[PDB]
Amino acid sequence: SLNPKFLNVSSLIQYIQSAYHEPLREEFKNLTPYVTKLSKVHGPNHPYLVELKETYDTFKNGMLEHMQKEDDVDFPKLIKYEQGEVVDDINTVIDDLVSDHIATGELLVKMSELTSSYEPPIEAAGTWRLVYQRLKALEVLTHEHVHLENHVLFKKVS
Amino acid sequence: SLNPKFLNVSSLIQYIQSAYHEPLREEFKNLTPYVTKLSKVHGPNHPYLVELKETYDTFKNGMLEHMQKEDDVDFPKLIKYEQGEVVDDINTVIDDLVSDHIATGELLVKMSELTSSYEPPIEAAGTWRLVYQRLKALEVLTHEHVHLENHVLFKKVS
Ligand SMILES: [Fe+3]
Ligand SMILES: [Fe+3]
Ligand SMILES: [Fe+3]
Ligand SMILES: [Fe+3]
Ligand SMILES: [O]
Ligand SMILES: [Zn+2]
């Protein structure tokens, strides 16, 4: 059980990528077909499952583009700033990054509302219950991720 | 709390250095005079105290040179190996580094045995109680330090 205090910016970014980015990206690939099946089968008579599908999709692609910007563009800046080099939009960067976290957040709220905190109705079975199950764990994984970035990584630079 | 398995060999090595190596060095600066003093004072009265001074000093000079071996020659050889460059001598390193861990190992046992189990007599006061506390302190940081290397960093490359 590491103390993050002792991880520098470059290594903490690494941990965030191995523990959160790469695990999230993979799950978004495995879950997505289940989430679309649930909406195609039981959406016809449960419309909220389609709102769930549509919301999950938006949260999903929101994450994936966001991470790409962090990995390929914005974490490199967070490093070179703490590596001394002049990065004059460091405050801009960090601001857009929380704008993104906030927004993905109120999206996770929406999914948690629609599912009633991921408790299936009894008349759910099979896919329906797995979808809820995995989303709940994804909601948890996403909160940890962003809390680590927000309250650890973004404070080492500012 | 953070999971060390997700760090790669180079991020983990940085962690070892900040969290363990640089602390241990700085503590050896601070604690060494007290050991010598407690040995000088109540050491005649009780000789096992000077057995302790000489045992601690051996474990000190040991750790110190062994961490410089890792910092200057062997944590490089491990990074360059994880990075894909051709490092033979790799298991020769991993095997000497545990040769030195197993060493500090049975040595820390003896310091602990010498000093009841870091239990100070009823005669002890001031100097004598600080040293035992700071040693049992130091004794546990080394367990963490050499358990991290042994079962994470070394099992990463192996
Ligand atoms: Fe991220
Ligand atoms: Fe993020
Ligand atoms: Fe070490
Ligand atoms: Fe070591
Ligand atoms: O993220
Ligand atoms: Zn797109």
* Alpha carbons B145 and B24: distance in angstroms, whole number: 9
Q: In Å, what is the CA distance from A103 to each residue of A50, A96, A100, A108, A156?
A: 20, 11, 5, 9, 23
DSSP A11: H
Q: Tell me, what amino acid is at B6?
A: F
| b/e burial code for range B125-143 (CB count within 10 A of at least 16 → b) | eebbeebbebbeebbeebe
SS3 for A45? Answer: coil
* A145 Cα: distance to centroid of ligand 1 (angstroms): 6
Question: What is the distance, to the nearest Å, from the Cα of residue B48 to the centroid of all Cα atoms in its chain?
Answer: 22
Q: Can you give the residue ranges of every domain in chain A?
A: 4-157
Calculate the alpha carbon distances from A53 to A101, A136, B153 in Å.
Answer: 20, 14, 42
Are A104 and A142 in contact by the 8 Å Cβ rule? The answer is: yes
Mark yes or no for CB contact A18/B6 under 8 Å.
yes
Nearest chain B residue to A17 by CA distance is: B6
What is the Cα–Cα distance from B12 to B4, expressed in whole angstroms?
Answer: 7
Q: Is the CB of A145 under 6 A from ligand 5?
A: yes
Q: Is B2 helix (H, G, I), strand (E, B) or coil?
A: strand
- Rounded CA separation B128/B120 (Å): 7
Q: Give how far the C-alpha of residue A62 lies from the chain's centroid of Cα atoms, to the nearest Å.
A: 8
Give the C-alpha separation, B22 to B53, whole Å: 22
Q: Is the CB of A60 under 6 A from ligand 5?
A: no
Cβ B14–A3 below 8 Å, yes or no? no
Residues facing residue A2 across a β-bridge: B2
How many Cα atoms within 13 Å fall on the side-chain side of residue B46? 15
Residues of B whose CB is below 8 A from A15 = 2, 6-7, 11
Whether residue A93 contacts residue A70, with contact meaning beta carbons closer than 8 Å, is answered with no
DSSP assignment, residue B4?
G
Q: Return d(Cα A143, Cα A146) in angstroms, integer.
A: 5
Distance CA A82, CA B28 (A): 30
CA angle B82, B86, B87 (to 5 degrees): 70
| DSSP secondary structure string for all residues of A53-68 | HHHHHHHHHHHHHHHH
CB B1 within 8 A of CB A4: no
Which residue type is seen at A34?
Answer: Y
d(C-alpha A108, C-alpha A115), whole Å: 11
C-beta of A66 in contact with ligand 5 (< 6 A): yes
What token pair was written down for A141? 């994984």
Whole-number Å distance between alpha carbons of A23 and A20: 5
Contacts of B26 in chain A (CB under 8 A): none
- The verdict on a CB contact (< 8 Å) between A7 and B1 is no
A2 three-class SS:
strand
Residues in A touching B8 (Cβ below 8 Å) = 14, 18
